[PDB]
Design a protein around this nucleic acid. Structure first.
Length: 124
DNA sequence: AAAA
C-alpha cells in the first residue's frame, strides 16, 4: 500500500524542480501530492534533490529528531527545498500555502531495511 | 513535514 518510504516520496519529494517555480509551488504541490486529502497539511517541505541523494541522508550525520527520537539525519550537504506553510487563508477543503524557497541542510528520520527516509524533520 |  501506501508504504512509509512511499509515503515520504509523495509528500516530501519533488525532484522535478530545482526549486519552487512560483509561489504557488506549494498550493499546486500540496494539493496534488494528496496532502490536502482530508485536511490541510499545515506544513510540509519539499526537497528538490534526487531520491538517491535524499535517501543518502540515512547514512549521513546522525542527529536527534526534534522529536527526541534518534533516527534522524542531517544532510552533510545542502538541498534545495521548498518549505510550505499554510496561510491564514487556508480553510479546508480550501488549502492555501506560503511557498518559501531555500537552500538548507535537511534533516530526516530514517527507517527500514533498506534504511530509507520515512519522515522529514527539519532543515537548517 | 513518522507511524496500532
Amino acid at each position: 500500500k501506501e508504504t512509509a518510504a512511499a509515503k515520504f516520496e509523495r509528500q516530501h519529494m519533488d525532484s522535478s524542480t530545482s526549486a519552487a517555480s512560483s509561489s504557488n509551488y506549494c498550493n499546486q504541490m500540496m494539493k496534488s501530492r494528496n496532502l490536502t486529502k482530508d485536511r490541510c497539511k499545515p506544513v510540509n517541505t519539499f526537497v528538490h534533490e534526487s531520491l538517491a541523494d535524499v535517501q543518502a541522508v540515512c547514512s549521513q550525520k546522525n542527529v536527534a529528531c526534534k522529536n527526541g527520537q534518534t533516527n534522524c539525519y542531517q544532510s552533510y550537504s545542502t538541498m534545495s527545498i521548498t518549505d510550505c506553510r499554510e496561510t491564514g487563508s487556508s480553510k479546508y477543503p480550501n488549502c492555501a500555502y506560503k511557498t518559501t524557497q531555500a537552500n538548507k541542510h535537511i534533516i530526516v528520520a530514517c527507517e527500514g531495511n533498506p534504511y530509507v527516509p520515512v519522515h522529514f524533520d527539519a532543515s537548517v
